[PDB]
Design a protein around this ligand. Structure first.
Ligand SMILES: O=C(O)c1cc(Oc2ccccc2)c(OCC(F)(F)F)nc1C(F)(F)F
Length: 130
């Protein structure tokens, strides 16, 4: 929809702190930090697919809005994820071991803005069309 497309990471703030707050170890944070992924968002019927592709790591999720699904994250957490659309924002929550983190995806001007929150840490990542 407004989200559909092939997006390239152009800026990131506080991603290392965000991964640290999630408990990600040094090697995986290193890989993640200097990744510059593409994010490819598509929709077919009820099903949204978000692929995140980079030289050292790829992930993919497919989901129906409002329906919980299992996910293995890029940092290898096994989580229960639910994604909803709220005022134009795709809101993802991941739940595991009594914790949660939120990842909000929104469209702003030419940007796909990704805000990731874990406890007191807020990370902002910005994608632009490829
Ligand atoms: O889409 C993102 O840019 C993104 C990318 C992530 O990791 C990568 C890095 C390279 C390739 C594919 C995935 C990631 O990992 C979970 C983490 F951060 F906990 F490790 N989380 C996110 C986000 F939080 F924002 F959704």
């Amino acid at each position: 929809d407004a989200f559909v497309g092939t997006w390239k990471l152009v800026s990131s703030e506080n991603f290392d702190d965000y991964m640290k707050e999630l408990g990600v170890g040094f090697a995986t944070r290193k890989m993640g930090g200097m990744a510059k992924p593409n994010c490819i968002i598509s929709v077919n019927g009820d099903v949204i697919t978000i692929k995140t592709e980079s030289t050292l790591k790829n992930t993919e999720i497919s989901f129906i809005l409002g329906q919980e699904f299992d996910e293995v994250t890029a940092d290898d957490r096994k989580v229960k994820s639910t994604i909803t659309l709220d005022g134009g924002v795709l809101v993802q929550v991941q739940k595991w071991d009594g914790k949660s983190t939120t990842i909000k995806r929104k469209r702003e001007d030419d940007k796909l803005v990704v805000e990731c929150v874990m406890k007191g840490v807020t990370c902002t990542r910005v994608y632009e069309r490829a």
